[PDB]
Design goal:
It comes from Homo sapiens (Human). Belongs to the BET family. This is Bromodomain-containing protein 4. It is found in: Nucleus; Chromosome. It is classed as dna binding protein. It is a single chain. This protein is mainly α. The protein has a single domain, classed as Histone Acetyltransferase, Chain A. Helix content is 51%, strand content 0%. The protein is built from five helices and no strands. Helix 1 runs antiparallel to helix 5. It binds the ligand Cc1nn(C)c(C)c1-c1cccc(-c2ccnc3nc[nH]c23)c1F. Ligand OWO binds next to helix 4 and helix 5.
Amino acid sequence: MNPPPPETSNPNKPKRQTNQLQYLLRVVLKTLWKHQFAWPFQQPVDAVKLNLPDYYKIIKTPMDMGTIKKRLENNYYWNAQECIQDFNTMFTNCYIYNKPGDDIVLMAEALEKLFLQKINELP
Ligand SMILES: Cc1nn(C)c(C)c1-c1cccc(-c2ccnc3nc[nH]c23)c1F
């Protein structure tokens, strides 16, 4: 069975909308979102649909761009580093569960390259 998704709403969190966090939503996430290989990462891994009954038995901190987008829209992050950490968790989860050369890994690799290019310079 699928776990509940990561939390995206928490009114008790200390909240900020920095220039970098606005940029991470308006520019970085929304550009990655339109990439041709973004679709597998636009929502939590559906282990039931994808017949990956061991996915959430190996991956303990799931992450996806749908969750990141919801977090950014809720000002869930205090700084850009917290949000960048979620992107890196998303890519790293993919590389952990899969193997070099798998289609999903090539797709994550492409998105990661673009992600690193877009975050090289923040406001
Ligand atoms: C690419 C691809 N090719 N095929 C044969 C399948 C079933 C896929 C695929 C479709 C949808 C999501 C995912 C996926 C997303 C994030 N992480 C994953 N880890 C393993 N699958 C993951 C996916 F790989």
